[PDB]
A paper describes a structure:
Here we report as yet structurally uncharacterised EAL domains from the core genome of Pseudomonas aeruginosa, PA1727 (MucR) and PA3825.
Ca2+ is a well known inhibitor of EAL-PDE activity. In both cases, the metal is coordinated in an octahedral geometry by Glu39, Asn98, Asp130, Asp160, a non-bridging oxygen from the scissile phosphate (P1) of c-di-GMP and a putative in-line attacking water molecule. Significant differences are seen in the positioning of the Asp160 side chain between metal bound complexes, with the second oxygen of Asp160 contacting a peptide nitrogen atom with Mg2+ bound; while the Ca2+ bound complex shows Asp160 bridging between the M1 and M2 metals. The different positioning of Asp160 and different coordination geometry of Ca2+, together with physicochemical properties, thus contribute to the inhibitory effect by calcium.
Residue numbers in the entry: 5 to 164, 173 to 260
The structure:
């Protein structure tokens, strides 16, 4: 058995599926978007998490097609059900540093946007800070062109350089320590105040407890994500939950 053959095969056999984690407003309410998380439906080994296969997809370069396959799948999955989505519904995708080279990404974004009514969803791309240090100001007509389509850019796992981004996502590690560490609390308050100075939206990730939600809401964190709001879930659970939310 070989890792490369297995992934390359799995992509052709459509074994990489989207799971969807909902985002909620900081002050609560209906779901305003989802983060798309990759899952490997392995026929032998079961449902396999990203951390056991994304690193090799990045080294081998195969994540770029995998992400394209995933974006296409999301358009199939949700393009027909646009009526169930609140206006400006956020759909986020995790993107690599290898994606940031050159211009294909723009085609894929235009393709996804074309599956929905114009302006009805907001497409978001999440990059970590560490993934931006490969080229920091060069072939970045890409970000200009992506923004011209109304695509937004989010810094993933923030807190764990000079752009050109619309949103910060507070890493789980900060949210985990809310209420039991004044230092981390002050640093988290700094990140939140920075986002407001720079006019960037902010999402908190890993919101598990009501203590955490209230703390973040009291400081105007725009959006929440985590097990409190809902775990990553298959297409069907999402459509079922969104159907309920159309009622009242
Ligand atoms: N403890 C805790 N964990 C929570 C909570 N809410 C969500 N999570 C987990 O946090 C991860 C999402 O954060 P991430 O920074 O994108 O971290 C992601 C992301 O870096 C990467 N990844 C996932 N899908 C993709 C993809 O399509 N492309 C790329 N390049 N990377 C991906 O794999 C990482 C792990 O993904 P998952 O295993 O799905 O792990 C998910 C999810 O299961 C919570 O309340 N508590
Ligand atoms: Ca993410
Ligand atoms: Ca990533
Ligand atoms: Ca994170």
């Amino acid at each position: 058995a070989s890792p490369s053959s297995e992934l390359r095969r799995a992509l052709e056999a459509n074994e990489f599926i989207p799971y969807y984690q909902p985002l909620s407003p900081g002050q609560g309410g209906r779901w305003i978007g989802v983060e798309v998380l990759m899952r490997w439906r392995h026929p032998r080994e079961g449902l396999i998490r990203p951390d056991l296969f994304i690193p090799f997809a990045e080294r081998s370069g195969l994540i770029v097609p995998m992400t394209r396959a995933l974006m296409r799948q999301v358009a199939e999955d949700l393009g027909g059900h646009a009526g169930k989505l609140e206006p400006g519904f956020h759909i986020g995708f995790n993107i690599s540093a290898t994606h940031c080279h050159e211009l294909a990404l723009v085609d894929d974004c235009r393709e996804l946007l074309a599956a929905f009514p114009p302006g009805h969803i907001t497409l978001v791309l999440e990059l970590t800070e560490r993934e931006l240090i490969e080229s920091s100001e060069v072939t970045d007509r890409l970000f200009d062109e992506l923004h011209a389509l109304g695509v937004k850019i989010a810094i993933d796992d923030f807190g764990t350089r000079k752009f050109q981004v619309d949103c910060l996502k507070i890493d789980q590690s900060f949210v985990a320590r809310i209420g039991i560490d004044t230092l981390s609390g002050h640093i988290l308050d700094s990140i939140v105040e920075l986002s407001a100075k720079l006019d960037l939206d902010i999402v908190a990730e890993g919101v598990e407890t009501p203590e955490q939600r209230d703390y973040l809401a009291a400081r105007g964190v725009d959006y929440l994500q985590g097990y409190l709001i809902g775990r990553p879930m298959p297409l069907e659970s999402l459509l079922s939950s969104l159907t309920v939310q159309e009622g009242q």
